[PDB]
Each structure stands twice: as structure tokens, then as C-alpha cells.
Design a protein around this ligand. Structure first.
Ligand SMILES: *[C@@H]1O[C@H](CO)[C@@H](O[C@@H]2O[C@H](CO)[C@@H](O)[C@H](O)[C@H]2NC(C)=O)[C@H](O)[C@H]1NC(C)=O
Ligand SMILES: *[C@@H]1O[C@H](CO)[C@@H](O[C@@H]2O[C@H](CO)[C@@H](O)[C@H](O)[C@H]2NC(C)=O)[C@H](O)[C@H]1NC(C)=O
Ligand SMILES: *[C@@H]1O[C@H](CO)[C@@H](O[C@@H]2O[C@H](CO)[C@@H](O)[C@H](O)[C@H]2NC(C)=O)[C@H](O)[C@H]1NC(C)=O
Ligand SMILES: *[C@@H]1O[C@H](CO)[C@@H](O[C@@H]2O[C@H](CO)[C@@H](O)[C@H](O)[C@H]2NC(C)=O)[C@H](O)[C@H]1NC(C)=O
Ligand SMILES: *[C@@H]1O[C@H](CO)[C@@H](O)[C@H](O)[C@H]1NC(C)=O
Ligand SMILES: *[C@@H]1O[C@H](CO)[C@@H](O)[C@H](O)[C@H]1NC(C)=O
Ligand SMILES: *[C@@H]1O[C@H](CO)[C@@H](O)[C@H](O)[C@H]1NC(C)=O
Ligand SMILES: *[C@@H]1O[C@H](CO)[C@@H](O)[C@H](O)[C@H]1NC(C)=O
Ligand SMILES: *[C@@H]1O[C@H](CO)[C@@H](O)[C@H](O)[C@H]1NC(C)=O
Ligand SMILES: *[C@@H]1O[C@H](CO)[C@@H](O)[C@H](O)[C@H]1NC(C)=O
Ligand SMILES: *[C@@H]1O[C@H](CO)[C@@H](O)[C@H](O)[C@H]1NC(C)=O
Lengths: 137, 436, 193, 97
């Protein structure tokens, strides 16, 4: 900061930094909601299970990109554990990764789809592009 | 002149590049985060504006899903992922530049590598990971301003390795199975014998390929090399794609900057009203920001719907050129590039497709005297195909698109009526192979 | 013009468009297909029509054996275009309504300046004459927001209409290539028959 | 009937007119003059709305340049300005009109 500047704003007039008036240190301000989150679901009335995609978050960072200490326990279940899967489009949690490719049911992105699939689970997989074939030229 | 005709004595194989946009950035907006900026008080006021945010998110979700349809319906036209053949030269035609190269891990062709280098993305890619915006003072960035205001780009469903996998399959089938690839299960054909069939599709006799095949292959190879030399040195060929990138970047940048507007409130900064005014009278100021910001956001969604319809119209056209130019041979003039269409090869490009149109171009035309009909013995003979032509001493039939003079036999011609009716009839002899 | 609305002239003046027309018909009259595929190759026009009859699947003789009838029918049919264009009032309706729509859009935009939008007056000088900044600015903002909203409407409508004109322009460009520079097998693309 | 066919014994040459729009009037708006007239006071308040005017002018400039594309891509398809032939009748076909 400049020696007399008290806060900083970006091109959006979002106040992104502030000088602490007591210590004179500079604090960054981040939005509470930061980043995109999207919920995978089959229909309600087929399962209440869901999976969560943290659209640009790194799977070890999910417990901090989400403020998992401030969340309810029922959400914090979706912050960690088994069934984390680092896709592109960020970390997917709550769907088990499966090595069989299938036609795309729910399009998650960056090559990944998910489906409610055989108990049943939400499973995530890479799309099959098509049938493998060769021409005996 | 009413009695002379120009026939091409030669031809050139031309390869022509057509660049088509197919998709745009799958933009997404957290409408509450944009308007009310995490403040709880404003969010209560935004509830009193009802369903506007839901309707805006629904619209942008339609745009996004449609971008995958556009990409799928262009590239995923072939259900069979015909793997790249081990040998890249067929009959002398060298496909090595448009097929993938196993010398690299990326399954792009060499041409596609140039295409993916020749366009620069405004973010260099969708990622700006969680920690990356909390940077130095110089590290302020319009992309971080976008994230802090709830604006994001979703990645496409098909990754570039998948688009390149489809184009590799399409060129592999085209290199090895011709038209049948579009009509059904791809049927193996020798490529020179496939090109011979495509010459008949022009109306050049099948021999003209085999009788010149080494020249034709050399011209094809050189033309593909001239594409590569242009795509390395050019700065403008993919402008139809870079300007789609630029337009969508600029639309988001103006949207975040529009948060700096006051819209007639005492301040552009929502915290600054809430800091400074009581709820009795802040709400009057907050409402001006809510309505103004919400108006700016609906402007963006409307123009995206406009731009998406334009891209979708372009994607439908690219999907038509894939079917008509790649999976077959098109009689539609200038549809599959200039010249008579022979073949097309699809190549992937960032948010687009590139068609290498291969066409026959007639060259070195020569003037000949010509006649509509021959009168042999009081009855008029017409060409079955082509035109009667005189080389100066002797009358022949030739095909129109390539000078190949043939003896005027009773096979090349059909007879109709006494030869008095046709104006410009001439008296040359018609040879009958039986009589000698 | 007083309110800042203007029409810019087209880049190609009508004499330049007419010059391209003249070249296109001249090539069609003298070189046929070759005009599209490459350097245009001279062909006698009766002999070009004979080829275009084969394109239908009518044997080449049927032209030469009837050429005077065909030429007369062609000439009369062109004359019937002239006689109808001299006497119709509606054949170009698809163009007159493109003129009318864009004129009407501008006329409603200037008339929208007569709106108050809930200000004390539609007239900006009248507010500024009558009120002090402390409270003029409230009234001025109601005019600014309403007027700026009226521009955003107009520009949206133009973007919609321009997309429609693209579709027609791309189609007309396709008919130039497929119908003028060639012969089309597409059943009903270049007119009936 | 399963065993009879109709064959045309004759034909008519037809000429048909298809009318197509290709461009529209290129339009330009001075967003400041439209909103504020000449009043300096209103122009200062309009600055507090920022880029709306710039964004509107950019949009209409896109329309305008696109109208020249539409005309060029229809008519300028041939690079050769083949001069009009001196004789307007070929084989009996009278191009003079
Ligand atoms: C068409 O023209 C090309 C050149 O414009 C001819 O190809 C050349 O032929 C000579 C003699 O065979 C070679 O020495 C050259 O290297 C060739 N160059 C190229 C670029 O092909 C070709 O022979 C002509 N075709 C016909 C049928 O006459
Ligand atoms: C096909 O074309 C290439 C030229 O593009 C020929 O040469 C190869 O070119 C690539 C780069 O383009 C190099 O990485 C290779 O090392 C080149 N190989 C050789 C032997 O020069 C290639 O040989 C051609 N293939 C055939 C079968 O003719
Ligand atoms: C098709 O019909 C037209 C008339 O509708 C025929 O033209 C007439 O032919 C007769 C005899 O040749 C002349 O007496 C008339 O004056 C012609 N009329 C016109 C308007 O040209 C024409 O011959 C018919 N076509 C065929 C192939 O039989
Ligand atoms: C071609 O058509 C015209 C009719 O439009 C024939 O007649 C001439 O037409 C123009 C107007 O288009 C008049 O100014 C001339 O005075 C007309 N001349 C005559 C002699 O009628 C014209 O003769 C036709 N040309 C040919 C070669 O047949
Ligand atoms: C008071 O302010 C001064 C100067 O900002 C700072 O050094 C100090 O730590 C603050 N608090 C106390 C208890 O002195
Ligand atoms: C986390 O991000 C780093 C780079 O910031 C990357 O190397 C790593 O792969 C990411 N996490 C995972 C699980 O891939
Ligand atoms: C999927 O395959 C990979 C192959 O490297 C393996 O590491 C992984 O354990 C497999 N997962 C399952 C669920 O089979
Ligand atoms: C064909 O004839 C015309 C007229 O004499 C002449 O101008 C032209 O150059 C000739 N073309 C060739 C290829 O001989
Ligand atoms: C015309 O073709 C015949 C082929 O038999 C040839 O003998 C003659 O020399 C040719 N004339 C010219 C002028 O090329
Ligand atoms: C061609 O034109 C000449 C005059 O240049 C004329 O004598 C001849 O009859 C015409 N023939 C044809 C078939 O047009
Ligand atoms: C063609 O032959 C007939 C009979 O020999 C003759 O009457 C006619 O004049 C000839 N025409 C030409 C152009 O030689």
C-alpha cells in the first residue's frame, strides 16, 4: 500500500485489501462464496445421493476452499474421504471413479461423465468416444 | 465467338483451408454473488426481485449445453473410431501431416499442433486455481475480478484429445474407405482407386488419374506442405476463431467493469452504502444498485443468446460440411472450397474445425474450333458426352474438363434426324469400328 | 439528426454492385460453369445450353433441334419479367418491408424521447431550468435510465434483425454460387422446375 | 395404374424471379447526444453509468461492418470484372434487358 492508503479496490470496485488500523499490516479480503460449486444428482425419487464438483479446486484444497470448519457436519462429509476424484474441471467428491467407459449420462466435463449406476452409486467415468475399429487397408 | 471453345489442357490439385467456429466459452454466473456481493442485507432485497436470477441462470445453462451439442454434432458423426493406419503414404499421397504422429504423446496431427498454437486464449486456459488470485498488487487481473464476482467459464465436455481422436478417425476412414464411410460400415478401398472414383465424380475419365498419378500425388503433397508453411508463418488465417475468443473475453470484462457504475446511487460500492446509511434509506440506494446491476447482467445474457445463435448457425454449417464434404463428394459449387471438390479432411482447432478442401482446378486452357453436331451421311450425330472439337486438321470428341481427343466413333455419338435442322452442323466422317 | 441518430452509407455504391452484376451475367453469357470452377472458358451459348440440358437429363439434340423455339420462349419470359416489374407494386415487398422496419425502429426511438419515465418532464432543459442539483439529479437519473433503456431495446432489436439479414445474405451468397456459377440438382433451390 | 406412365411431349422455358434481402441500413447512435443533448450537467451524470454507451456503439458498429460483409460475400464472389460483350444476342438469346 501507499503509506496513507487504507484500502485497495480492483477494477470491479471489489475491496480486495485493507490496512489493519492497529498493526498497519495489509490484509487480503476474499469473498466468502469463492469459486464455483455444482451438485451432481440423479433424480430425486430415485436417490437422495449427490456428488459435488468444486469447479476449479484441488482435492487437497477442498477443505479450505470450502470453509469446511464452518460448514455443517452433513456438508463436511462432502469435503473429504474416499470417493474424491481429481478431474479436470476441479475435484469431484462423492462419486466413485470407475475404469469402464460408458456413453455419457450426466456430463460433468473435461471428458468426465457420471451416472447413477450399479446397491447403486453415483459413479464417474471417462466417456467412450465410440466403438474401437480398424480397416484392413 | 460462336464457333470456338476453350478446353483445359492441364490441371492442378489445390488444397484450401476453411476455418469455422463451432463453440464458445460456456460462461456461467452466480447471479447473487454478482449483484449482492456476499452481503446478507442486499440478498434479502434481491429476494424481492424474485425469479430474475433463476431465469438468467437458466438462459446461460442453455447456452452452455448447446456448446456441447455443437461440438458433438460436428465431430461425433462417426460411430467407429477407425484407428490410425501404421503406414501414412497411400499410393504416394502422404497423409503423415494430417494424421497423428506417434513421435509425440499428444494425438494431434502436425497441422493441428499449428492450429492449436496459432490461437491465443485470453486466460491461457480455464484454470485460475484457488490460491492464484491472492497475489501481489501487480497480480490483479480481470480474470480474478471475474471470479470474485461470480463469473466463471465451464470447461467443454469433450477435451481436445477427444476432438483430435475424432478427426484422426475421420481422416483414417477417408484415407482407407471413401464414401462408404458415410453411407454405412466403411468399406476398404485402395486410395488411388478411391481418387479415381472421385475423378469420375468431377467428370474426368478414370484413366486421367492413373495415367498421371505420380504428378497428382506430388501436387497433393506440395499443397499440404504449403498449408503447413502458411500456418507456421501466418498471423491471421484463424482470425474467425480468435475473434470469437476476443468477443467473449470482452463481454465478461465489460460485465465486471459495469460493477464500478453508480447507476445513480451515492456509491458504486455496496459496502459503502451499508456502512454509511440506515436501512430506512440505504434500501433506496441499494435498490438503484440492484436494478442497475441486474439490468447490466441481463444485457450480457441477451447478447450471449445472440452470439450463441450465430455460433450455432455456424456449427450447423460445419456439421453439414463434415457430412457433405468429408463423408462424400459434393456437387454444390463452392460449398467444399473453390474448384471441383475431390475430398476434404477435417482438422481440429480451438473452438473450431478446419477443413482442408482438396479440389481439381483445370489449367492451361486452349482454343479449339467446335461444332454442335456432325453430319456423316445426311443424318446428324451428336456427342454422347463432351464436345466435338477440331485440333486444326481433324475432328474429335473430347471431355469438357480435360483435353483428351478421341476418334469420333459411332460409340462416342448418337444420331437424331436428318442433318438439316441443326444450325452449325458439319460434314466430318464418323468412324464405325465394324466396317474395317 | 438532432438527437444523434444517423445512417451511414454502404461501402459499395450501387454502381459498384451493378458492376458486379454485369460481370456475373457476362461470364454466364460467355463461359458457363468454368466461370465458377476457375478461369472462365469461352463457350458458345447455344452449346452451353446444350450441356445444361444434359444436366436435366434431356438429350443434347433436344436443344439444337428446337433452338429457335427455346430462344423465343426465353426472350418472352424475360419480357414478362419486365412487364410485371413495370406494373406490380408488391414483388419486392421483401425489400420494402426491410426498409420500413428499420425506418420505423428509428422513428419510435426518437419518439421515445417524449417519454417522462416518471420524471416531472420529458424535457431535460426543463428539469435543469426548474430544479437545483440536489433534486434535479433525481429527475435527471430517471430520464437517463429510461432513455438508456430505450437505446438498449433498439440495439437489441437491431442485433435480432441483423441475424435475420445474415441468414438471407448467406443464402443469397449460396444461390449465387450454386445457381448462378453452376447448375443445381437441388429440387427447388433455384426456382421451380 | 400399375402399367401406364405419363411422359412430357413438350416443355416450357420458364424465368422466375426470386427477391432476397442482403443488407440493411447501417445505423449509428451518438449515445451521449441522444441521452443528454448538449447539457454538460447531464453528461456528468451519464459518466456515472460508465460503459453503457461504449457497449451500445460497439454493438451497432458490429451491425454496420457486417452489412458490408453481407454485400461483399454475395456480389464480389468473382475476381474478374468480365467486361460486357458488345453483342447482346447469343444464339438467339437476347440478354439486352
Ligand atoms: C501440367 O503442367 C505441369 C507444370 O505446370 C507439368 O508438370 C511438369 O512436367 C515436367 C515434365 O514432365 C516436369 O519436369 C516438371 O517437374 C513438372 N512439374 C510439375 C509441377 O508437375 C505437367 O506435365 C502438365 N500436365 C500435362 C498433362 O501436360
Ligand atoms: C511424408 O512427408 C514428410 C515430410 O513432411 C517426409 O519426411 C518426414 O518429415 C517429418 C516432418 O514433416 C520428419 O519428422 C521425418 O523425419 C521425415 N522423414 C524423412 C524420411 O525425411 C516423409 O518421409 C514422407 N513420407 C513418405 C512415406 O514419403
Ligand atoms: C410445344 O408447343 C408449342 C406451342 O405451345 C409448339 O410451338 C408451335 O409449333 C407449331 C408447329 O411447329 C407452330 O405452328 C406454332 O406457331 C408454334 N407456337 C409457338 C408459340 O411457338 C412447339 O412446337 C411444341 N414443342 C414440341 C417439341 O413439339
Ligand atoms: C433484344 O430485345 C429488344 C427488346 O427489348 C429488341 O428491340 C429493341 O429494344 C430496345 C429496348 O429494350 C429498344 O430501345 C430498341 O429500339 C429495340 N429495337 C428494335 C429493332 O426493336 C432488340 O432488337 C433485341 N435484340 C436482338 C438482337 O434481337
Ligand atoms: C495501538 O496502536 C499502535 C499504533 O498503530 C500499535 O503499535 C499498538 O500495537 C496498538 N495497540 C496497543 C495496545 O498499543
Ligand atoms: C493441484 O494443483 C497442482 C498445481 O497447482 C497440480 O500439480 C496438481 O496435480 C493438482 N492436484 C491434483 C490432485 O492433480
Ligand atoms: C483403474 O485402473 C488403474 C490402472 O492404472 C488402476 O490404478 C486403478 O486402481 C483402477 N481402478 C479401479 C477401480 O479398478
Ligand atoms: C483464344 O482466342 C482469343 C481470341 O483470339 C485470344 O485472345 C486468346 O488469347 C486465345 N487463348 C489461347 C489460350 O490461345
Ligand atoms: C491433329 O490430330 C492428329 C491425330 O491423328 C494429328 O495427326 C495432327 O497432327 C493434329 N494436328 C494438329 C495441328 O495438332
Ligand atoms: C457464327 O458467326 C458467323 C459470323 O461471325 C456466322 O456467319 C455463322 O453463321 C455463325 N454460326 C453459328 C452456328 O452461330
Ligand atoms: C455437306 O455435304 C452435303 C452433301 O455432300 C452438301 O450439300 C453440303 O453443302 C455440305 N456442307 C458443308 C459445310 O460442307
Amino acid at each position: 500500500f501507499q503509506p496513507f492508503q487504507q484500502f485497495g479496490r480492483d477494477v470491479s470496485d471489489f475491496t480486495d485489501s485493507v490496512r489493519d488500523p492497529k498493526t498497519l499490516e495489509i490484509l487480503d479480503i476474499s469473498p466468502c462464496s469463492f469459486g464455483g460449486v455444482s451438485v451432481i444428482t440423479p433424480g430425486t425419487n430415485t436417490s437422495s445421493e449427490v456428488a459435488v464438483l468444486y469447479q476449479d479446486v484441488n482435492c487437497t484444497d477442498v477443505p479450505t476452499a470450502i470453509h469446511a470448519d464452518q460448514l455443517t457436519p452433513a456438508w463436511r462429509v462432502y469435503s473429504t474421504g474416499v470417493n474424491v476424484f481429481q478431474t479436470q474441471a476441479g475435484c469431484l467428491i462423492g462419486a466413485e471413479h470407475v475404469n469402464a467407459s460408458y456413453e455419457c449420462d450426466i456430463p460433468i466435463g473435461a471428458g468426465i461423465c457420471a451416472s447413477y449406476h450399479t446397491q447403486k452409486s453415483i459413479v464417474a467415468y471417462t466417456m467412450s468416444l465410440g466403438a474401437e475399429n480398424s480397416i484392413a487397408y | 465467338s460462336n464457333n470456338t471453345i476453350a478446353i483445359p489442357t492441364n490441371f492442378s490439385i489445390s488444397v484450401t483451408t476453411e476455418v469455422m467456429p463451432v463453440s464458445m466459452a460456456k460462461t456461467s454466473v452466480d447471479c447473487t454473488m454478482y449483484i449482492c456481493g456476499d452481503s446478507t442485507e442486499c440478498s434479502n432485497l434481491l429476494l424481492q426481485y424474485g425469479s430474475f436470477c433463476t431465469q438468467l441462470n437458466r438462459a446461460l445453462s442453455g447456452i452452455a449445453v448447446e456448446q456441447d451439442k455443437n461440438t458433438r454434432e460436428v465431430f461425433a458423426q462417426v460411430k467407429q473410431m477407425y484407428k490410425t493406419p501404421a503406414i501414412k503414404d497411400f499410393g504416394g499421397f502422404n497423409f503423415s501431416q494430417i494424421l497423428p504422429d506417434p513421435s509425440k504423446p499428444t494425438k494431434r496431427s502436425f497441422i493441428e499442433d499449428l492450429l492449436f498454437n496459432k490461437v491465443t486464449l485470453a486466460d491461457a486456459g480455464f484454470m485460475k486455481q484457488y490460491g492464484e488470485c491472492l497475489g501481489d498488487i501487480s497480480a490483479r487481473d480481470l480474470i480474478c475480478a471475474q471470479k470474485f464476482n461470480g463469473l466463471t467459464v465451464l470447461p467443454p465436455l469433450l477435451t481436445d484429445e477427444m476432438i483430435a481422436a475424432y478427426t484422426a478417425a475421420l481422416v483414417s476412414g477417408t484415407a482407407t474407405a471413401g464414401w462408404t464411410f458415410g453411407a454405412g460400415a466403411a468399406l476398404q478401398i485402395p486410395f488411388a482407386m478411391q481418387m479415381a472414383y472421385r475423378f469420375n465424380g468431377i467428370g474426368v475419365t478414370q484413366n486421367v488419374l492413373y495415367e498421371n498419378q505420380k504428378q497428382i500425388a506430388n501436387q497433393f503433397n506440395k499443397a499440404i506442405s504449403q498449408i503447413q508453411e502458411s500456418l507456421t508463418t501466418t498471423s491471421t488465417a484463424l482470425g474467425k476463431l480468435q475473434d470469437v475468443v476476443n468477443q467473449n473475453a470482452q463481454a465478461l470484462n465489460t460485465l465486471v467493469k459495469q460493477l464500478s457504475s453508480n447507476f445513480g446511487a451515492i456509491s458504486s460500492v455496496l459496502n459503502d452504502i451499508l456502512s454509511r446509511l440506515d436501512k430506512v434509506e440505504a434500501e433506496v440506494q441499494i435498490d438503484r444498485l440492484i436494478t442497475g446491476r441486474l439490468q447490466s447482467l441481463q444485457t450480457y445474457v441477451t447478447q450471449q443468446l445472440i452470439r450463441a445463435a450465430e455460433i450455432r448457425a455456424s456449427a450447423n454449417l460445419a456439421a453439414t460440411k463434415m457430412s457433405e464434404c468429408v463423408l462424400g463428394q459434393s456437387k454444390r459449387v463452392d460449398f467444399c472450397g473453390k474448384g471441383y471438390h475431390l475430398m476434404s479432411f477435417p482438422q481440429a482447432a480451438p473452438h473450431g474445425v478446419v477443413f482442408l478442401h482438396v479440389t481439381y482446378v483445370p489449367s492451361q486452357e486452349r482454343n479449339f474450333t467446335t461444332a454442335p453436331a456432325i453430319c456423316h451421311e445426311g443424318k446428324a450425330y451428336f456427342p454422347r458426352e463432351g464436345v466435338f472439337v477440331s485440333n486444326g486438321t481433324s475432328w474429335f470428341i473430347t471431355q469438357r474438363n480435360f483435353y483428351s481427343p478421341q476418334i469420333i466413333t459411332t460409340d462416342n455419338t448418337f444420331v437424331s434426324g436428318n442433318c438439316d435442322v441443326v444450325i452449325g452442323i458439319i460434314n466430318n466422317t464418323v468412324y464405325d469400328p465394324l466396317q474395317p
